[PDB]
């Protein structure tokens, strides 16, 4: 009888949202529906384009029910407030969405409450102004959750999906596979933070005040994460956006999506995570996440930059190109904070910078660099959390070792209470793989210096891709 989606997000051990308020920007809603009556406040804010009744409020009503519905909702408690930015045809404007976001911020300033979650179950093409407004609202301390988009395309080409600091959610089905429907389906790629149930999702139907209907979409998926976030923020109201994102990743089901569904180049970029509620088991723990940059593009001196949130530390930095035409990567300071920078090679199509960003308070971290030797070595003379290497040439023990013609960089942290170890694995090979042990957190992933495309952490597994390769994982714990 439990809807498949609500079971799916239930953790393997278990035992809401009322201190939190969830704003919904959507079609009009049937607020007297019994799933949500008394739980959704209609603001009567409205900014919608002209057209060009049951149908008018179907989308919004269903999603209010996914978030907060008394029988089929994720956060059955939660208070919601709704703004109307989509017309009867499900169409809105960028300007209308901006005015809506601005209305939420003004409301907050006039009558402050607790943590706010804003669900944006909508998408248009990439928009500079919409992304900037989202970013600004996130920096003001509001959590934003948005749909990845339903076009079976790269979510970075859409807004607010592509918007920095917003939690972007793709849709998976009952078999934990990405939703597809011909040329249509869940978006994917590096702007998606995680997936959540978004096919065959039962919820309030505006056909009648007690009716239910199954609907599909990345908005339904996003509504699950909005619900989960509201619950997480009720339990731990002081969470920063970066702490909340790290928990959502950490409590997700991992490696359950078959990545064959995605286009080949998007597989490495797309997180293999399906959202879940935190377990009754939660005592400090080391949380890390992998942050892929935008592709640098093909310019000879091109660089890609991957950054961490202000309250995170960059513990390592890697890079990847599909061709292998690569000059590696280095950690460089920038506004007094370390970023991961990767360098394209001459004639390369471009590269990605790949940061490992971790929540490590009281850490004092530095970088130790050695320029090319005649091989090259550097050590934390402190625990080593990461090795990087870059070169300027066209071709060839708390210690990092690089090529004799390359610079080598060690990330060294003073982190009392932190234990780290290094695990190596090598074989004759398109891909070699080495995983940290359960309860340990991968902080760094690199290849021992036959032609490597790059290296990247996937959860707590270090992956090395080549065209006698040895993967090296640095693993730490409290």
């Amino acid at each position: 009888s439990i809807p498949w989606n609500l079971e799916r997000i239930t953790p393997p051990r278990y035992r809401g949202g009322s201190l939190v308020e969830v704003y919904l920007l959507d079609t009009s809603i049937q607020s007297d529906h019994r799933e949500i009556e008394g739980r959704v406040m209609v603001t009567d804010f409205e900014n919608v384009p002209e057209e060009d009744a049951s149908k008018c409020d179907s989308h919004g009503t269903h999603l209010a029910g996914v978030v907060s519905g008394r029988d089929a909702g994720v956060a059955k408690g939660a208070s919601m407030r709704s703004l109307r930015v989509l017309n009867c045809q499900g169409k809105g404007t960028v300007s209308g969405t901006l005015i809506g976001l601005e209305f939420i911020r003004k409301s907050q300033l006039v009558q402050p409450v607790g943590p706010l979650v804003v669900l944006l179950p909508l998408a248009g093409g990439y928009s500079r102004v919409l992304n900037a407004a989202c970013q600004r609202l996130a920096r003001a301390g509001v959590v934003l959750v948005t749909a990845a988009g339903n076009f079976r395309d790269d979510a970075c080409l859409y807004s607010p999906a592509s918007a920095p600091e917003v939690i972007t959610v793709g849709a998976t089905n009952a078999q934990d596979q990405p939703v597809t429907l011909g040329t249509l389906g869940t978006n994917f790629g590096r702007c998606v933070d995680l997936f959540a149930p978004g096919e065959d999702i039962i919820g309030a139907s505006s056909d009648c005040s007690t009716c239910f209907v199954s609907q599909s979409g990345t908005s339904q998926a996003a509504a699950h994460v909005a619900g989960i976030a509201a619950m997480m923020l009720s339990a731990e109201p002081e969470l920063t956006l970066a702490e909340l994102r790290q928990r959502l990743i950490h409590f997700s089901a991992k490696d359950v999506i078959n990545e064959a569904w995605f286009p080949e180049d998007q597989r490495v970029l797309t997180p293999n995570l399906v959202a879940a509620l935190p377990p009754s088991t939660h005592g400090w723990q080391l949380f890390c996440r992998t942050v892929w940059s935008a592709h640098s593009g093909p310019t000879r001196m091109a660089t890609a930059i991957a950054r961490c949130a202000p309250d995170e530390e960059l513990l390592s930095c890697s890079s990847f190109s599909r061709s292998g035409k690569r000059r590696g990567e280095r950690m460089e300071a920038q506004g007094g904070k370390l970023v991961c920078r990767a360098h394209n090679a001459f004639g390369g199509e471009g590269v990605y910078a790949i940061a490992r960003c971790c929540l490590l308070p009281q850490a004092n971290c530095s970088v130790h660099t050695a320029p090319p030797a005649e091989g090259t070595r550097v050590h934390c003379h402190h625990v080593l959390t990461g090795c990087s290497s870059h070169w300027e040439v066209e071709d060839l023990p708390n210690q990092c070792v690089g090529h004799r013609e390359a610079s080598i960089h060690a990330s060294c942290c003073h982190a009392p209470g932190l234990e780290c170890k290094v695990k190596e694995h090598g074989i004759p090979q398109e891909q070699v793989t080495v995983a940290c042990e359960e309860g340990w957190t991968l902080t760094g992933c690199s290849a021992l210096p036959s032609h490597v495309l790059g290296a990247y952490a996937v959860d707590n597994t270090c992956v090395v891709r080549s065209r006698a390769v040895t993967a090296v994982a640095i693993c730490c714990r409290s």
Partner: protein
């Protein structure tokens, strides 16, 4: 240094309405004056304009209904960071 942007997905563009985004610390009083200035400069050129909304609190700026003919003029206004043509969003 002010730049123009519109939706790459051509069917989703909504020409004739523009979001004028001003530089980060621009004050509401300045946004309002910049809007009136655009309308005055436009009217002298024979163009009707309508200021639909003045933004403050997240981004400073304003929403204006006008011919795209005026974009070169608008990009030269004081405080302008960039201008974006309005476009469609859709239930997902």
């Amino acid at each position: 240094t002010a730049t123009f942007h519109r939706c790459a997905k051509d069917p989703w563009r909504l020409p004739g309405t523009y979001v004028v985004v001003l530089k980060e610390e621009t004050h509401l009083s300045q946004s309002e004056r910049t809007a009136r200035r655009l309308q005055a400069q436009a009217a002298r050129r024979g163009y009707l304009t309508k200021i639909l909304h003045v933004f403050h609190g997240l981004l400073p700026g304003f929403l204006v209904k006008m011919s795209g003919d005026l974009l070169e003029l608008a990009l030269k206004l004081p405080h302008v960071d960039y201008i974006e043509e309005d476009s469609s969003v859709f239930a997902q």
